[PDB]
Design a protein around this nucleic acid. Structure first.
Lengths: 96, 93, 80, 104, 104, 93, 80, 96
DNA sequence: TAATGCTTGTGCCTTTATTAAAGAGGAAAGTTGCGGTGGATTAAAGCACCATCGTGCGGAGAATACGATAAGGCTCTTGCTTCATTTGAAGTTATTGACAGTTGAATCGAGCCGCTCAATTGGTCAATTATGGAGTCAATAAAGG
DNA sequence: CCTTTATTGACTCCATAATTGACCAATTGAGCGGCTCGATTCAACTGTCAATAACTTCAAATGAAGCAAGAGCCTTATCGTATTCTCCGCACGATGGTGCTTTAATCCACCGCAACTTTCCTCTTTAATAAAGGCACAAGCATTA
């Protein structure tokens, strides 16, 4: 059985997912999450579909940017695996 | 020309809160600038709120929503409570 | 309608990281990312719900979300 | 000629704030209740900041508020620090913070 | 009835922009020359962005500009990327960038 | 209600720059949002400029200063050049 | 006026770093800090000079600097 | 001759300079630098004194914040010495 | 621990200049009055938002073998800190002068507000072409030999 | 280098939907006019920014000594990765109900404009005392033993 050495498939996925414009998070779970979060602010809320779509786009873009910053932080410390401390440092410097 | 500032009112509030504590001129100016900044923030936010809903009037409702959107958390809740109390007292007299 | 934060599966987080250029991912990244995403959504949805409530509406529209995002310096085109 | 400030039981200038709202051209018309609400909110914020500043002045053993105490009060409260994250206070100094890994 | 757009040699709606400026209550009065200047500036910015987007579309062997091309044009030019740093463009994707230290 | 947009003018500019290249509806909407954002930025900045100097009017000078303050570098220089050319053309005929 | 950027002496940079909590400083920090300070001053002074030029003045006032700072999200208190 | 071991005097300076509100950069060199920089934008400019004071306050506060972020970046990489790469990373994450 | 340098925290007198206090008057807040324009109320339609149902199939959860990456430990050498000497430039003070910011008027240019109109553009319906989807081939790159 | 194999770009053909085009109306840019104000120019005053000189003295520049921290290298073990199997619930298509969003009409009430009064706040002047500064002193930390 031909097995790829670890790390090359990750590189192929990096190349492939950076080329596409598709949304990566499944739509229905994200919609349920948004509704649950909004339930704590005001009960009996209806969501226009475009509102949930905009929320998903914004959340995915924010997460991609955060992961780019996290990768920079991880590379700075002479590593290739991102860790929770990298995310914490990135969010700390960004002022979040 | 006469320069208009909130120094008198801020001093009155200070005497209401800390009877025996004084304030320097630099701190007075800093507090005045802080209050001006907050006033401007709330005013522009309320103007945007009025513009979005096509209403030509700014009312206490726009100010309340501006307070909720601008101030964070417990600070916003207490500010809303104080504003509602003041408006109720003004109207009921 | 609770615990839908676990609906953001591990493959989804892996795909988002891959899109960001990440080559290897630790084990606690999934929980950390879920927490930060929940915080971001809480802020944006709070602002959007306030905007919706002011207009005396019951349905959250895309314009409310766009205004809530623009309030935080994250202007989004394509939903005007 | 009763003032609106004492009419609403406030210390801040309801009339002056109403004139400011009128002059700023934020909208064509300004409601009667808007300046009272805005004056109350500003009064509450000023009272909160001044209370924290006086507390900081007391714990320092001074009887006068200086910009250092305002900076300390702003940076010691989470809500104000969120509200005033980008704000720089002249002569405010910084909160004393030494990282653990630097200690001997 | 000569339109002000072609009177000034522009493509953008000078009259519509003048009406927008007057309606927005940005000031009590707007000069006759202000909407022409604003229309010219907006036309230049639109032409620049569209030219970069069309170049990006052509480089990809495509005939119609899509949001991906707009995102690529924005992020490949320093000036617009500085102007549009905080902007998220729907369906724009990201610029392909892999760190040299990750390569095999 | 009739929604007012810059689709026609953006399409004319596109045909002037790229004669054989078309544009999708999504890209057209994104360009429309971009132009609206820039218009709002310049308008509020010019309003602040007029407020600072206590002038009740907005003229081409306020727009020029708003352009030089908001747009960066060579982009602002070229925008100023184009605006001045347009104003001269409008005035001289 | 030339090479006045060297007027920001090494002890000044050391004092600024100490105020920031830095325990040890490298040798190239001084040049890096001089460069970043020059960039920041260039931006702020450009905005202040534009504000001054608009008002048809020849003297840069404190209010112009305050407005230039507020344009970049760094509002400064005590100079109003 | 009594000599302090390295690092203790640095810690004392850290404690002392965080307690004070004084400006650390000398006024006259900073004023000359500001005038030199402004000479490139418009010739024959006069500066009100409060303008230069505000510029100095803003620059010093910005540098202090940048050095705090740099110290966080240096500590993240298991070091106590701040380096140019730390400043570069901090400014990169802040979006400068 | 422990003695000693040693820098910093603490207690007391001075002054000063920095803040607390009083006044003239003028500049802005309160009041009355009017009225039309904006906001609150109500009825109605229509679309949009939600809850239900079926299926079926690609993507998610769970093991399993494993190898390579993060982490720990040792060594060294070199870069940075601490101390001391010399110096040179910033800080403070007093002086002068002229440039430029500001306030006050006259005023002539110019932009706001009405009324008409009609021409440009936006909602609605038709479409064919550029792109999406499926299937196949050739080119590319990676891994064990 | 080489060979096999998994992966993807290209290539082609068909579907499809969606972007371009034509048309009716609708509402809004343009033209003319009247008219009040504002922003331009001029003038003088007056505030202060720049340039000068002088002296002091403390902070910066430089050199030595040394030591400890960053970096390189080796070893390990454990933990993320790739591959396979099973399954499960998301996506798509249809439906049906209803509620809530938007629009139109009406009424009423409330805020802008204006003039007058009046009384409250703001520069100018006066003082008094809190803290910086200086001086003497105690005290806990650092350091080498």
């Amino acid at each position: 059985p031909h097995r790829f050495r670890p790390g090359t498939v990750a590189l192929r996925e990096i190349r492939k997912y950076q080329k596409s414009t598709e949304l990566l998070i499944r739509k229905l779970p994200f919609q349920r999450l948004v509704r649950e979060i909004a339930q704590d602010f005001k009960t009996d809320l209806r969501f226009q579909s475009s509102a949930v779509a905009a929320l998903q786009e914004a959340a995915e873009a924010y997460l991609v940017g955060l992961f780019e910053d996290t990768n920079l932080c991880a590379i700075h410390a002479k590593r290739v695996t991102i860790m929770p401390k990298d995310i914490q440092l990135a969010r700390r410097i960004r002022g979040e | 020309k006469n320069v208009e500032t909130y120094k008198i009112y801020i001093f009155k509030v200070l005497k209401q809160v800390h009877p025996d504590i004084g304030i320097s001129s630099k701190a007075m100016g800093i507090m005045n600038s802080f209050i001006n900044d907050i006033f401007e923030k709330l005013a522009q936010e309320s103007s945007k709120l009025a513009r979005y809903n096509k209403k030509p009037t700014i009312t206490s409702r726009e100010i309340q929503t501006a307070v909720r959107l601008v101030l964070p958390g417990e600070l916003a809740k207490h500010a809303v409570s104080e504003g509602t109390k003041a408006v109720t007292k003004f109207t009921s007299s | 309608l609770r615990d839908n934060i676990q609906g953001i599966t591990k493959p989804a987080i892996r795909r988002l990281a891959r899109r960001g250029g990440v080559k290897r991912i630790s084990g606690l990244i999934y929980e950390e990312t879920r927490g930060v995403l929940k915080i971001f959504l809480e802020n944006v949805i709070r602002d959007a719900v306030t905007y919706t409530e002011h207009a005396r509406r019951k349905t959250v529209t895309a314009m409310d979300v766009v205004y809530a995002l623009k309030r935080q310096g994250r202007t989004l085109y394509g939903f005007g | 000629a009763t003032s609106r400030s004492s009419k609403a039981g406030l210390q801040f200038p309801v009339g002056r704030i109403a004139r400011f709202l009128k002059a700023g051209k934020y909208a064509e018309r300004v409601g009667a209740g808007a300046p009272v609400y805005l004056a109350a909110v500003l009064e509450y914020l000023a009272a909160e900041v001044l209370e924290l500043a006086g507390n900081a002045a007391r714990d320092n053993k001074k009887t006068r508020i200086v910009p250092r105490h305002i900076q300390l009060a702003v940076r010691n409260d989470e809500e104000l620090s969120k509200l005033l994250g980008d704000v720089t206070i002249a002569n405010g100094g910084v909160m004393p913070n030494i990282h653990n890994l630097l200690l001997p």
